[PDB]
Design a protein around this ligand. Structure first.
Ligand SMILES: [Cl-]
Ligand SMILES: [Cl-]
Ligand SMILES: [Cl-]
Ligand SMILES: [Cl-]
Lengths: 107, 108, 109, 109
């Protein structure tokens, strides 16, 4: 699974509200930064983030950066409480797993 | 405006993404202390801190302490994508204005 | 015309000098700092305010982890008069000889 | 048996003595040090870790600004090798003969 394939499968997992399935894409010492300043390190914390964050339905996913080791996706997240939000997912990949995902809310 | 009213109006104005209006609740040398050890002193600096916030709603407010000069609110900040955050706002109030607001993130 | 590594090193030098304006001048007009917790300071005045809000601190033991034409990662130690040393990562995205975005991640102690 | 002001004075004395275990033993088991705001040391192990990692720098002219049965505010000047003298504020929340929370603020000129 290439970096772009991991990024796409992560988005698929989150759309299914499948925290454990998303966590299995990360290295054991992988982490989600969401947002900057709030870090979820390791499989348990990553699955807990997905489970605690609102139920996500993504749309209009665009691949902004794509390489063997880094992928940037931009997309729109629809949620029960807010206007559609432009979200940026920055994936750092090594060894066929995600080492770090940083999630920015674009203004 | 009593301290509890200033605290409630601050939450209302941040929910409106109104940096200028939130800042006018503070004394001219009032300050916000926020992560990590950042001190925003004065109306311009407080408005900048407020305007840097993610789009969010701040609700489920519990009034933990209330007095003439100190108010503590607990609440939940929700955002489109991130997990709900438990927040504590500690308002030090003197003479109809906020002198210091300390913002503590609480355990999830 | 400063290269990305030059902008990154100068940013650190300006922050050690408490110099919010000089640090802001390293950014594009619509450049930004993303800092805890999800705070985005966009534009020169906001960046200046963020920098001025820092406590007296010195930023040293810089290791240049990544350097290229358009992206720089620095790791460093921030020391203060009373608080514990903090391990910090600065990620600079650079375009057209200015910083488009600086992301500031706290690392494990 | 120790009053709130006694807890605060003993905390400063144990930190000045570089005794992180002894300072932690003044706190509730789920007590915390916030130092600075946004950086939280929860529980005795983390509190000992803060004390051991923070500068040994010493509080000299400690002033007792606020005291009561459940809250104490101390102000003092800490002098460190590489900074100007720094005005520091220690805010102790006390319940049941133990420190529930200590917040450490670096006061700005
Ligand atoms: Cl996500
Ligand atoms: Cl706020
Ligand atoms: Cl910085
Ligand atoms: Cl201390």
């Amino acid at each position: 699974m290439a970096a772009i394939d991991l990024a796409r499968e992560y988005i698929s997992r989150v759309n299914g509200r499948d925290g454990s399935g998303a966590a299995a894409l990360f290295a054991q010492d992988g982490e989600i930064i969401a947002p900057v300043g709030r870090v979820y390190r390791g499989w348990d914390a990553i699955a807990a983030f997905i489970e605690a964050a609102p139920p996500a339905t993504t749309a209009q996913i665009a691949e902004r950066t794509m390489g063997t080791h880094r992928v940037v996706l931009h997309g729109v997240v629809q949620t029960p409480r807010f206007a559609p939000a432009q979200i940026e997912w920055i994936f750092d990949v090594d060894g066929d797993r995600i080492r770090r995902l940083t999630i920015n809310h674009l203004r």
